Amino acid sequence: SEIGTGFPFDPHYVEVLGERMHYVDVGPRDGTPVLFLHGNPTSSYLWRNIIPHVAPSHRCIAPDLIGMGKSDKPDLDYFFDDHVRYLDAFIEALGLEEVVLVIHDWGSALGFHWAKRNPERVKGIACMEFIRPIPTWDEWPEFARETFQAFRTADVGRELIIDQNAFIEGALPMGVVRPLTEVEMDHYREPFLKPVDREPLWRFPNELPIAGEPANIVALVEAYMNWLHQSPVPKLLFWGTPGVLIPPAEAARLAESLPNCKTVDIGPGLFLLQEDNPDLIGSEIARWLPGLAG
Ligand code: NA
């Protein structure tokens, strides 16, 4: 597939709530910008081979979430609400008005939550392996079930994620169909070389709305899934087999229940669909974008 391992983007940094957040910023500076939101345990690196399909026709902005990627690492609890506050302010610091969202994992919770609060400002949502309510563990795929249950068990989770760096060395390769190369692994490892900096990677999977907990995250996600269900905004939904957060049966269900939703099968896929078929994801987004103007 010739999947590029390089990250050939000029680094940019903007002051947000007294901290520096890194972001990619390429492509033309008129038109509607496309805002790329990664999740755990990733960063803007996740979008490296999708962005070139879009940059020719649209501005691409891809921030690194606070405590992740090349962004500053303040001493926060790194709950979802921390991420909401920082992204809201990133968005304001960049003077963005209307945007198109391209989102994944916790980047999708952030995006969908920002959309619900600012519906008039989002012209489209491209999403994949995104956060929805997981009412039973039974719907979490077997192969990844014990991994995440352990992440969420008291003290054992921290030892795995902070001490063994398990999210990076274990969960991450598991969530990619193809074998990641060492070069790719080293980019992903980069922000988390020091154990103490791995805090956001532990808090996040403990924020996942699974089996009713944490209750506040469940309610928030349900609220944005309800907004999404009601919203006429154009939607582009990428899915793989068997997936992780989004099983093929869930995508098919959403294909019918979500208004103005086009679904796209990337082929074999787990968690980081971007790593398995970035050419289809990129080119489909690029084809879909011009229609957003009406
Ligand atoms: Na997570």
Side-chain angles (χ1 to χ4, degrees), residues 40 105-106 131 148 167 204-206 208 271:
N40 52 221
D105 188 65
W106 282 104
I131 307 294
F148 282 70
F167 205 164
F204 283 169
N206 283 274
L208 289 169
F271 184 52

